[PDB]
Symmetry: C3
Subunit: 131 residues, 3 copies
């Protein structure tokens, strides 16, 4: 089986519950759902994910972009801002997934920037080894 996706933002989005990437560049298997913002596992196995978020949140308060699986943080990234030189929040993971597990990016204390033409905020993943 062949499962891989790469998605970005068609406009700035907030991500209080989930950052809903809506610019879908690659979606092999159709397992990423832009209406929910989640990648839902249909093949049990080992996956790679990576994200890279351009975050704005004003002030001088920290901000985070987390990768979640089923509501548990599996990687986190803290960004400052420093409204001058923004911040990107990024990380990468290898995770084991069961069928029905949900993987997504969540924002804490800041907004994600990007658009159709400037694909700044991205999220990708693919299946490494099926069980």
């Amino acid at each position: 089986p062949k499962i891989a996706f790469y998605v970005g933002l068609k406009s700035p989005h907030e991500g209080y519950e989930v950052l809903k990437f809506d610019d879908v560049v690659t979606n092999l298997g159709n397992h990423y759902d832009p209406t929910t913002g989640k990648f839902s596992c249909q093949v049990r196995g080992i996956y790679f994910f990576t994200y890279h978020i351009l975050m704005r949140g004003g002030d001088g308060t920290s901000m985070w972009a987390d990768l979640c699986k089923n509501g548990q943080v599996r990687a986190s990234a803290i960004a400052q801002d420093a409204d001058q030189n923004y911040d990107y929040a990024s990380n990468s993971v290898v995770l084991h997934l069961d069928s029905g597990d949900e993987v997504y990016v969540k924002l804490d204390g800041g907004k994600a920037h990007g658009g159709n033409n400037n694909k700044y905020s991205t999220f990708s993943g693919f299946l490494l080894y099926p069980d």
Copy 2:
């Protein structure tokens, strides 16, 4: 992960411009010899799904913003904006998964800054590999 084996990882022997294309000349891995450091482009011979990632140490930005773009046949498919200037560098990075037809080219281009690195200090990188052939 079964058919042909294609993967590359490259960097800079010295600082380079890349206004049309950043020509990484430090070839660490080049399974299949499909990255060409004379053109700075990865050229697909195997139709399928590919992962790419890049991480460019940029400076020279006066005060303005600079960009590192990943292109495919002249179309930007990912961007990173870097806004340091005051002194020293800032990184511009991204990752993508793209479908390629035979003969498509993938490469990194720069706007408003210069990529830094050297065999000494492998700061600026470009890597990719085939995930699934069609």
Copy 3:
């Protein structure tokens, strides 16, 4: 052979010789050894690695996170934020490994930050193509 790992940091660590990631999230094959901090190849082939280190200790100097194979740097990342906050140092490689080769992250000029709670600093890798 399914060989992949994702590891993070349970507490702040030095990494002047090797950053010993101690939060083992994924370790297919058990080839990453949290006691040494090294991933160790018994299957020769082509591997992807990526790392993302949140560092501190930059006074008026830069800091580095380097990815090494058998003592040789194969990727470097310079981090320069000092006056305030923290700064990430990150990179990705594709490398051929011989059986026995050791891959690990090494720091210079600063200290890695994190917790099992604050999962900021990460290291991941997987076998792409066995020879």
